[PDB]
Amino acid sequence: GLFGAIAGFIENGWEGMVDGWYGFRHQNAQGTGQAADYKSTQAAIDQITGKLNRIIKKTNTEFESIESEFSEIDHQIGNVINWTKDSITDIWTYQAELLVAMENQHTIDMADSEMLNLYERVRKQLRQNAEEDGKGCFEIYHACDDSCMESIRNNTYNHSQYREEALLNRLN
Amino acid sequence: GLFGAIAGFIENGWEGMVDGWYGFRHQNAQGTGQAADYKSTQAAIDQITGKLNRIIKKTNTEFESIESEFSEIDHQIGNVINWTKDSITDIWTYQAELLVAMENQHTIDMADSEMLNLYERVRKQLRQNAEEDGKGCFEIYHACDDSCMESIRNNTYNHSQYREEALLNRLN
Amino acid sequence: GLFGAIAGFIENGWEGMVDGWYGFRHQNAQGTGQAADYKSTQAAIDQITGKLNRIIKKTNTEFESIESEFSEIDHQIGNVINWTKDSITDIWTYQAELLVAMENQHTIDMADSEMLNLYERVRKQLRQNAEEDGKGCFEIYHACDDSCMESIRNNTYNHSQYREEALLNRLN
Amino acid sequence: DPDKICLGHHAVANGTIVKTLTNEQEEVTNATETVESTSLNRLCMKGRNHKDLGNCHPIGMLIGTPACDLHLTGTWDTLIERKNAIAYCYPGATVNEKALRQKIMESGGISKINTGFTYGSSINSAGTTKACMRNGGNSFYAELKWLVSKNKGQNFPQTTNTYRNADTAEHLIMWGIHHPSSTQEKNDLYGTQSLSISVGSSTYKNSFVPVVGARPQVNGLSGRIDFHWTLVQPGDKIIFSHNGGLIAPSRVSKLIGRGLGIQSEAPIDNSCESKCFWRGGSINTRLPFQNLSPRTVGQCPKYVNKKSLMLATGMRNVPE
Amino acid sequence: DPDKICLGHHAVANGTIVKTLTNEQEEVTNATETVESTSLNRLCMKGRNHKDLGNCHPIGMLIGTPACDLHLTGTWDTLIERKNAIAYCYPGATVNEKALRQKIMESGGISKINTGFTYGSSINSAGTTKACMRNGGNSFYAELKWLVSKNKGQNFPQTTNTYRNADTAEHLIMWGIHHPSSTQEKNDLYGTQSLSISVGSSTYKNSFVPVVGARPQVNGLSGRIDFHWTLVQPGDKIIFSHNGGLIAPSRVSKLIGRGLGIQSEAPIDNSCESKCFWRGGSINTRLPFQNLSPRTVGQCPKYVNKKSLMLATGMRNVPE
Amino acid sequence: DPDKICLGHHAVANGTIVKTLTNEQEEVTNATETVESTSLNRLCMKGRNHKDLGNCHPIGMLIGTPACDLHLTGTWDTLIERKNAIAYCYPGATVNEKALRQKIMESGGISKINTGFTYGSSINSAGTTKACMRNGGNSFYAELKWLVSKNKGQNFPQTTNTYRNADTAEHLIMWGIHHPSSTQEKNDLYGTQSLSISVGSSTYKNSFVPVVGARPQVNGLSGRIDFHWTLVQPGDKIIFSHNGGLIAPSRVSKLIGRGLGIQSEAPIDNSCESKCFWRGGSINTRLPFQNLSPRTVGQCPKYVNKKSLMLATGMRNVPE
Ligand SMILES: *[C@@H]1O[C@H](CO)[C@@H](O[C@@H]2O[C@H](CO)[C@@H](O[C@@H]3O[C@H](CO[C@H]4O[C@H](CO)[C@@H](O)[C@H](O)[C@@H]4O)[C@@H](O)[C@H](O[C@H]4O[C@H](CO)[C@@H](O)[C@H](O)[C@@H]4O)[C@@H]3O)[C@H](O)[C@H]2NC(C)=O)[C@H](O)[C@H]1NC(C)=O
Ligand SMILES: CC(=O)N[C@@H]1[C@@H](O)[C@H](O[C@@H]2O[C@H](CO)[C@H](O)[C@H](O[C@]3(C(=O)O)C[C@H](O)[C@@H](NC(C)=O)[C@H]([C@H](O)[C@H](O)CO)O3)[C@H]2O)[C@@H](CO)O[C@H]1O
Ligand SMILES: CC(=O)N[C@@H]1[C@@H](O)[C@H](O[C@@H]2O[C@H](CO)[C@H](O)[C@H](O[C@]3(C(=O)O)C[C@H](O)[C@@H](NC(C)=O)[C@H]([C@H](O)[C@H](O)CO)O3)[C@H]2O)[C@@H](CO)O[C@H]1O
Ligand SMILES: CC(=O)N[C@@H]1[C@@H](O)[C@H](O[C@@H]2O[C@H](CO)[C@H](O)[C@H](O[C@]3(C(=O)O)C[C@H](O)[C@@H](NC(C)=O)[C@H]([C@H](O)[C@H](O)CO)O3)[C@H]2O)[C@@H](CO)O[C@H]1O
Ligand SMILES: *[C@@H]1O[C@H](CO)[C@@H](O)[C@H](O)[C@H]1NC(C)=O
Ligand SMILES: *[C@@H]1O[C@H](CO)[C@@H](O)[C@H](O)[C@H]1NC(C)=O
Ligand SMILES: *[C@@H]1O[C@H](CO)[C@@H](O)[C@H](O)[C@H]1NC(C)=O
Ligand SMILES: *[C@@H]1O[C@H](CO)[C@@H](O)[C@H](O)[C@H]1NC(C)=O
Ligand SMILES: *[C@@H]1O[C@H](CO)[C@@H](O)[C@H](O)[C@H]1NC(C)=O
């Protein structure tokens, strides 16, 4: 896709992540775990909610009948009405198809961008203490326990604390 | 946003930058600096001017009256005209709303992309001589005087000039 | 452009590359070469094919005549038909212009994104063995023969094999 | 070896297919419908002073056809017309009928005002017919009078009647012209004299002659009564001059305000609200589009030639 | 010294200009046209049981104008009308002509049914005119008869003719009224009596009087024959009562099914197919838009006021 | 600690709110209006050869009502009709009035051609009325003549008047029919004879009878003069045959070219220019949309049901 993350360098989604749209899986000495990211999830949901608020509505224009259901209509005027109504229906059918196609494309690419923005946030947080594996994971070159993993997820990880350890493990 | 810079990893805009839309602030031994970036600014402005040229215009079709202001109109044809005009108005109101919503989304995201493209250009110039702080700044690990700073803004900074000094400071 | 590669950090296209839309050029001690990338090229082509399938079509609504070619029409109804047809023409002319303008913008930016996604795949493959030059190239800090270059092109390059050599060359 | 943190996104086992600009078979985690396919099979009349006409045609409200006896006056914001409604008990038709029906169906009520027309002793003003029965008895249009000679064969006397609009709003006046089945019948009802009916106001002028040409029986009657109408402006007079063949108005109509006219087959429900109506009932959807019918009235979703259009409400679904 | 791998994209020598949201002159590697500018100068009639009327006007098929002798009956899915087609050989016009022509051009065929109208010895039903030539001699509309008095100057007899619709579908009946050029001509053809023609069905009635007013010559003729029409419903009858001036139907018409009416000057071509037609010919494009004409019929691309709209099918062209 | 370079973007103190696809309240640095809300309260007539009719109604230009004396001929690209404009000084109406007014308001001028009609000694062609005052004296429509019997009570003679179109373009011919207030009045003006007016061309014919039926006084006059019209083609004749009641044309009209018809109450301004007009004035905006009125003429922005639609002309505003 446009931003290269969802159906891109992220191989596939996680069916086991039911409390969020985006999140983390980690591996350390204590074991493995999973956690959803609130900020990225809500950013995506709020944008889709905004689309729904704009799209799911009708006009307030009051229309009256110009075609009799139960009696005859004039032949000349009736033909003009039929031409006009079918022309209007072609326009709305076209507009409806284009709207939903365009909006769907944007929704998919918007979701992709929020995945990438989360990935980019974490990359910059970790700084010189980790390396990208190419599949959406960061290999962290220091002991990073459950509290350390929480600090990465919380956006409170201080790279300076682990830099000496990490550069020794990375570069030797 | 889509590209993650404006209202993203860049915390806020600069009200003190009056001669451009994007630019640089710096700190070195010589002093504190600020300068606008012409190319990114003009790229954004030209794209917006392009939109305004396409949108700020009317059709050259000449319409005549089909509804008398001061006289009576036939009842059957009058109802057809009222239905048709209100149907046409609903279409144009809808088109106008969609146009401006879509254009505003694209304008905002286009501006975000130009910010990111400038940031990315600077990142690649600095190469291994600087590190990202996560807030749109680069910490430069060598003495980078006013001429050095100007070479970055000019896209004529050669990383090899300062690489030995920078790596010694980065690795300590 | 939106993703910063095409007409961006990549200075220009290659007229010599006639077997693909995106690809590679390499230089090592043994010579130079060129090769197209199949997956990125096909990703771009398939999306453009998708647009053409949706756009290149007409409605199946059957319209009949409401304006006589070889005979006079009533003046009042004729004026209503003229107003209606010109109003419908203005809508379709506007919609066609907006459709093609919007689609052209998206096609150009989609193509840009596929260039960037290929560049990003290669960056992550090379890991700590190469550095970006800012022009769409990677300088590889170990001897990378034709088989090594081929392994990069076909997504089988294992960084760990060359990492020891590359880190010593990068840190000098 | 290094520790690891992995970034990811959710997925579902069963995704939903949507169309995009570049892909007609794009799988997403969730989607929602934009085209309404369902209707309520009732006319949702909560919050509306409505009138269901039943077998009464709108025009029959002005002339007083027996089927319209409960609907000669009233007020409403919504007027419901039904299939096979009756306007004419006696064989005939109204000139400019479509415009008249539309005026009534745009109205918010009808009031009736007496014309005050009177007739001399040689006129029978209470003519009736088997075509227009009220409970097994011969009758006539309630708002009109069939004038004939009291003595069979005698010349119907020259008569002139005037209705003045004493109101500040325009009134709608209707009258009929009787077209007899034969010369003998014409002579019996109106005499051997040449017949002529003149109608004249400040804004309207017309003349009518009863015609006696041979025509087939409709409900056993070769006679016809055709209706004509005009608007009488505030303060104006309309003068009827006639010597046989006029079906004269005993009252005129005043259409009050505005209302929504609905033609539908659906039964009334006073417990639900709605702003959109069609032949088959009410559309209460929040969706922007519908595929029920191109013929709707009120505040409605736009009709589209589409069964479904799914709007994505989630990311690309990339299952494990 | 490091080795190098460079990522890039293709370019072309000859790029194409397109418009985007932000740029009126954006160069791309390739593009394709979305507005059709070309048309085939012919009516592509393959797969269509078509009828080219030539010099026959659609209304002439019902009355039997000499130019329509080969088009009095038939079936078709496509009917082609031409410029300057003749309906009225004798000077005149049809009342409600536009509605009638549209009905014929909407149909998929015409059938004819005998009225069975017969006339007594004092009527000459073989009236003809130089206006309507057939076989190099004076003739008349094939589906009608010009009735005049057998003896010049004598009163045309009071006559009744009744057409009964014994079919399950409605029949279209046409008749004419002759309007003489003078009182002397009127007296010669129909006598000195006052003339009156009445027509009556269950759903229609009208009365006509021949008018003898002075008027200029149209192809040497000051007389006029005006046509009138109505639909006779299944099981109904229509009664003509007349004493001079009626141009009476020998046959009535039945319009069968539906078809596409085309008005064009372009020649027929059975070699190829089309779904879209206009004055200049056929439009066989796959493109969504066209700029040939706003007046088209069938299944067509939408008309736009634009010469060209190029859709990009490639990336930005950035040549060397 | 290291030196640093920071990338950033501008912001403003007071941003502007716009709507996007995903956000109804998005703050940007700048935006501009796309819907015009303001109108100039005048008709901008710079660069237009225009005619302001004042209290002259367009139809009055053809018949020559006193209010239209300065608007009987001319050329223009823009024709301005005002409210309460006078067409008929004498009580009456024009048949097919709406089509006629539209033809005049579509034209780019009117030329007048003499009919050359003359009348014998037993006709008084100088009939006048207090309804149509001119310079304080009883007068009449300038382009027509009220023909009455010279001797009061005497039969108006059987009269013929013929106009031939000698021009290469079609001419619009108008005439009136007088409908007297009573039998005594009818007898005084035209005699006791039965009255008939026949009008006949190649493409038109009709017969008229003055009607005497009772009707109310309009400015003290129960009489009526109704107008009729037709187009006489190049080379064709039109023949009037009449014996009392014809209001005969002294001139015919030729409509020249095309122009823009405006109906408005706003005053003329020759300093300002515009291509779009409505009832309340002019719209000379560059913006694509407007919310002033759905009823406009010329080259206009499209009407929309919106107060404002702000288009972003800058990035997201993120203040410090
Ligand atoms: C980033 O990009 C910008 C824009 O291109 C560059 O800006 C230019 O920088 C050059 C070099 O400093 C400027 O050229 C210099 O102008 C000086 C001032 O000239 C005026 O005043 C002097 C003194 O009164 C007069 O002699 C002269 O005629 C002018 O009226 C000159 O003093 C400089 O000349 C001296 O240095 C040069 C070498 O640079 C010698 O050849 C000369 O002999 C002399 O000793 C010189 O001409 C230029 O004006 C700037 N342009 C703009 C538009 O601002 C930056 O250099 C670039 N930065 C980096 C780091 O790459
Ligand atoms: C021998 C034969 O078949 N003769 C029919 C003849 O019966 C028929 O006349 C009509 O027959 C019906 C049958 O129910 C009624 O009797 C009609 O009478 C009334 C009516 O009810 O309509 C009586 C009524 O009192 C009359 N009202 C007035 C005000 O005069 C009306 C009225 O005269 C007529 O409706 C006017 O057209 O008639 C009776 O007329 C005729 C039908 O045309 O046909 C013969 O062949
Ligand atoms: C000076 C002038 O032009 N006066 C015309 C006069 O010529 C015209 O007479 C008609 O002229 C045409 C010319 O081609 C024919 O000769 C008409 O003869 C026929 C006809 O062919 O139409 C003969 C035919 O047998 C007649 N048919 C019947 C059934 O009677 C018809 C018929 O009488 C008329 O068409 C009825 O109007 O005429 C000849 O009458 C007259 C009539 O148009 O008008 C003068 O002004
Ligand atoms: C007390 C009362 O209500 N009396 C009216 C009486 O006024 C009216 O007569 C008409 O009165 C009007 C004034 O309002 C005119 O004076 C009419 O006269 C003229 C006219 O000016 O229109 C005179 C003119 O010379 C006549 N012109 C010709 C060509 O004959 C015309 C003409 O006869 C009529 O307009 C034709 O309809 O009239 C005067 O007739 C009478 C009759 O309406 O009614 C009383 O109730
Ligand atoms: C208009 O369309 C309706 C529905 O398809 C059809 O029944 C009707 O015949 C059409 N009107 C005319 C005048 O043909
Ligand atoms: C059309 O709408 C106008 C108001 O814009 C209204 O006054 C008029 O009654 C409508 N026309 C008809 C024929 O009802
Ligand atoms: C409708 O437009 C056509 C083509 O421009 C023109 O010939 C015609 O005059 C117009 N119709 C009316 C009734 O003015
Ligand atoms: C889509 O989302 C809605 C709202 O969260 C949810 O209730 C529903 O389960 C989803 N749709 C389907 C078809 O599962
Ligand atoms: C552009 O596409 C067309 C097909 O529409 C093809 O014939 C042509 O070879 C292409 N040209 C270039 C320069 O790619």
**Which listed ligand is nearest to D222 at the C-alpha?**
2
Q: Which residues contact D239 (CB under 8 A, 6 or more apart)?
A: D160, D161, D162, D198, D199, D200, D201, F213, F214, F215, F216
What is the distance between the alpha carbons of residues D52 and D50, in angstroms, rounded to a whole number? Answer: 7
Q: What are the start-end ranges of the H helices in A56-74?
A: none
Q: Are E142 and E70 spatial neighbours (Cβ–Cβ below 8 Å)?
A: no
Inspect the interface and report whether the beta carbons of D286 and A56 lie closer than 8 Å: yes
**Out of A61, A62, A140, closest to residue D3 by CB:** A140
Give the H/E segment covering residue A23.
strand A22-28
Q: Are C153 and C125 spatial neighbours (Cβ–Cβ below 8 Å)?
A: no
**Which listed ligand is nearest to F103 at the C-alpha?**
7
CA angle F20, F26, F30 (to 5 degrees): 100
Q: Which residues pair with F268 in a beta bridge?
A: F43
Inspect the interface and report whether the beta carbons of D200 and F215 lie closer than 8 Å: yes
Q: Does F23 touch chain A (CB under 8 A)?
A: yes
- According to DSSP, residue C161 is labeled G
Strands F78-81 and F50-52: parallel
Among residues E266, E290, E307, which one ends one of the domains? E266
**Helix axis angle, A75-126 relative to C75-126, nearest 10°?**
20
Q: Kindly state if the Cβ of D217 falls inside 6 Å of ligand 2.
A: yes
Rg (CA), chain F: 30
What is the distance between the alpha carbons of residues E67 and F248, in angstroms, rounded to a whole number? Answer: 41
Q: Kindly state if the Cβ of C78 falls inside 6 Å of ligand 7.
A: yes
Q: Are D188 and D155 spatial neighbours (Cβ–Cβ below 8 Å)?
A: no
Q: Does E306 touch chain C (CB under 8 A)?
A: yes
**Which listed ligand is nearest to D28 at the C-alpha?**
8
CB atoms within 10 A of CB C3: 25
CB atoms within 10 A of CB F209: 13
Q: Kindly state if the Cβ of D198 falls inside 6 Å of ligand 8.
A: no
Contact residues of C toward F, CB < 8 A: 74-76, 79, 90
Q: Kindly state if the Cβ of A68 falls inside 6 Å of ligand 5.
A: no
Q: Are E236 and E204 spatial neighbours (Cβ–Cβ below 8 Å)?
A: no
Q: Kindly state if the Cβ of A75 falls inside 6 Å of ligand 5.
A: yes
Residue F18 shares a structural domain with residue F127? no
What is the distance between the alpha carbons of residues C114 and B67, in angstroms, rounded to a whole number? Answer: 54
Per the structure block, which two tokens stand in for A50?
């905004």
Inspect the interface and report whether the beta carbons of E215 and F239 lie closer than 8 Å: yes
Residue E13 shares a structural domain with residue E99? no
What is the distance between the alpha carbons of residues B45 and A57, in angstroms, rounded to a whole number? Answer: 34
Instruction: State the residue for tokens 């589906």.
Output: E143
CA angle C152, C157, C160 (to 5 degrees): 140
Q: What is the DSSP string of C41-76?
A: HHHHHHHHHHHHHHHS------B--SS-SSS---HH
Q: What is the DSSP string of E162-229?
A: EEE--SSS-EEEEEEEEE-SSHHHHHHHH-SSPP-EEEE-SS-EEEE---------BTTB--EEEEEE
| Chain D: closest CA distance from residue E251 (Å) | 20
Nearest chain C residue to E263 by CA: give it.
C69
In the sheet that holds F50-52, the strands lie side by side as F50-52, F78-81, F260-263
Between the CA of D106 and the centroid of ligand 6 the distance, in Å, is 10
Nearest chain C residue to F106 by CA: give it.
C79
Q: Are A57 and B94 spatial neighbours (Cβ–Cβ below 8 Å)?
A: no
State yes or no: A79 annotated in a binding site: yes
Instruction: State the residue for tokens 């009520």.
Output: D109
CA atoms within 13 A on the CB side of A126: 28
CB atoms within 10 A of CB E98: 17
Q: Are A89 and A96 spatial neighbours (Cβ–Cβ below 8 Å)?
A: no
Between the CA of D11 and the centroid of ligand 8 the distance, in Å, is 13
Class of the domain covering A22-161: alpha beta
C vs E: CB pairs below 8 A: 236
What is the dihedral sign for C-alpha E43, E48, E54, E60? negative
Q: Which residues pair with D9 in a beta bridge?
A: A22
Q: How many domains does chain F have?
A: 2
- The single-letter code of the amino acid at E119 is Y
Strands E268-269 and E43-44: parallel
Q: Are F80 and F48 spatial neighbours (Cβ–Cβ below 8 Å)?
A: no
CA angle F22, F25, F31 (to 5 degrees): 100
Per the structure block, which two tokens stand in for E283?
């439009």
What is the distance between the alpha carbons of residues A93 and A80, in angstroms, rounded to a whole number? Answer: 20
Residues of C in contact with A85 (CB under 8 A): none
Q: Which residues pair with C140 in a beta bridge?
A: C130, E3
What is the dihedral sign for C-alpha D290, D296, D298, D302? positive
Inspect the interface and report whether the beta carbons of B15 and F10 lie closer than 8 Å: yes
Residue E104 shares a structural domain with residue E23? no
Residue D14 shares a structural domain with residue D115? no
Residue identifier of the C-alpha nearest atom 3 of ligand 8:
D30
Residues of C in contact with D22 (CB under 8 A): 46-48, 50-51, 110
Q: Which residues contact A150 (CB under 8 A, 6 or more apart)?
A: none
Suggest the residue from B14, B73, B91, B100 to mutate for an interface test with chain F (most F CBs closer than 10 A).
Answer: B100
Suggest the residue from B73, B87, B88 to mutate for an interface test with chain A (most A CBs closer than 10 A).
Answer: B87
Q: Give whole-number Cα distances, A166 to A148, A170, C38, C124, D133, in Å.
A: 14, 6, 38, 19, 104
Per the structure block, which two tokens stand in for D113?
């005002």
Strands E171-179 and E35-36: unpaired
What is the distance between the alpha carbons of residues F21 and A53, in angstroms, rounded to a whole number? Answer: 10
Nearest chain F residue to B69 by CA: give it.
F263
Inspect the interface and report whether the beta carbons of C134 and B124 lie closer than 8 Å: yes
Breaks (C-N over 2.5 A) in chain E follow: none
Between the CA of F251 and the centroid of ligand 7 the distance, in Å, is 27
Q: Are E223 and E74 spatial neighbours (Cβ–Cβ below 8 Å)?
A: no
Residues of the domain holding E101: 49-266
Residue F251 shares a structural domain with residue F186? yes
Q: Which residues contact E198 (CB under 8 A, 6 or more apart)?
A: D211, D213, D214, D215, E205, E206, E207, E208, E239, E240, E241, E242
Q: Which residues pair with F248 in a beta bridge?
A: F145
- The single-letter code of the amino acid at C120 is E
Q: Are D50 and D77 spatial neighbours (Cβ–Cβ below 8 Å)?
A: yes
Return the domain boundaries, chain B: 22-161
Q: Does F295 touch chain C (CB under 8 A)?
A: no
Cα Dmax for chain F: 124
Chains touching C (at least 3 CB pairs under 8 A) are A, B, D, E, F
Q: Are D81 and D105 spatial neighbours (Cβ–Cβ below 8 Å)?
A: yes
Per the structure block, which two tokens stand in for F159?
């009269």
CA angle D132, D137, D143 (to 5 degrees): 45
Listed residue (E50, E306, F97, D7) closest to B59, CA to CA? E306
Residue F42 shares a structural domain with residue F168? no
Q: What is the DSSP string of C10-49?
A: B---BTT--S-SEEEEEEETTEEEEEE-HHHHHHHHHHHH
Contact residues of D toward F, CB < 8 A: 160, 196, 198-202, 205, 207, 236-239, 241
Q: What is the DSSP string of chain E?
A: --EEEEEEEB--SS-EEE--SS-SSEEES-EEE-EE---BSSEE-TT--EEE-TTB-HHHHHHT-GGGTT-SSEE-SEEEE-TT-BS-SSS--BTTHHHHHHHHHH-SEEEEEE------TTEEEEE-EEEEEETTEEE--TTEEEEEESSTTSPPPPEEEEEE--SSS-EEEEEEEEE-SSHHHHHHHH-SSPP-EEEE-SS-EEEE---------BTTB--EEEEEEEEEPTT-EEEEEESS-EEEESEEEEE-S--EEEE--SPEETTS--SEEETTEE----SSEE-S-S--EES-PEE-S-S--EEE-SPBP---
Residue identifier of the C-alpha nearest atom 8 of ligand 9:
E30
Among residues F248, F266, F284, which one ends one of the domains? F266
Q: Which residues contact E184 (CB under 8 A, 6 or more apart)?
A: none
**Out of C2, C90, C170, closest to residue B61 by CB:** C90
Residue E62 shares a structural domain with residue E162? yes
Q: Are B131 and B148 spatial neighbours (Cβ–Cβ below 8 Å)?
A: no
**Which parts of B61-104 are beta strand (E)?**
none
Q: Give whole-number Cα distances, F118 to F62, F155, F162, in Å.
A: 20, 18, 10
Name the experiment that determined this structure: X-ray
CB atoms within 10 A of CB B9: 21
Q: Burial, D136: exposed, middle or buried (Cβ in 10 Å; 0-12, 13-18, 19+)? A: exposed
Q: Kindly state if the Cβ of B89 falls inside 6 Å of ligand 6.
A: no
Inspect the interface and report whether the beta carbons of D24 and C53 lie closer than 8 Å: yes
Between the CA of D37 and the centroid of ligand 9 the distance, in Å, is 43
Contacts 24+ apart (CB under 8 A), E296-299: E296/C63, E297/C63, E297/C64, E297/C65, E297/E260, E297/E261, E297/E262, E298/C62, E298/C63, E298/E260, E298/E274, E299/C58, E299/C59, E299/C60, E299/C61, E299/C62, E299/C63, E299/E275
Instruction: State the residue for tokens 């009929």.
Output: D176
Nearest chain D residue to A166 by CA: give it.
D2
Chains touching A (at least 3 CB pairs under 8 A) are B, C, D, E, F
Q: Give whole-number Cα distances, E320 to C5, C13, F20, in Å.
A: 16, 7, 39
Residue E167 shares a structural domain with residue E77? yes
Residues in chain A: 172
What is the distance between the alpha carbons of residues B61 and B52, in angstroms, rounded to a whole number? Answer: 21
Interface of E with A in 148-167 (CB under 8 A): none
What is the distance between the alpha carbons of residues F82 and A119, in angstroms, rounded to a whole number? Answer: 69
**Out of B50, B59, B61, closest to residue E23 by CB:** B50
Residue E181 shares a structural domain with residue E53? yes
Q: Which residues pair with F124 in a beta bridge?
A: F148
Per the structure block, which two tokens stand in for D210?
């009863």
Q: Give whole-number Cα distances, F191 to D2, D123, F183, F194, F243, in Å.
A: 123, 33, 10, 8, 9
Residue D184 shares a structural domain with residue D86? yes
Per the structure block, which two tokens stand in for B93?
């109101």
Among residues F250, F266, F282, which one ends one of the domains? F266
Inspect the interface and report whether the beta carbons of D218 and E201 lie closer than 8 Å: no
What is the distance between the alpha carbons of residues C133 and C130, in angstroms, rounded to a whole number? Answer: 10
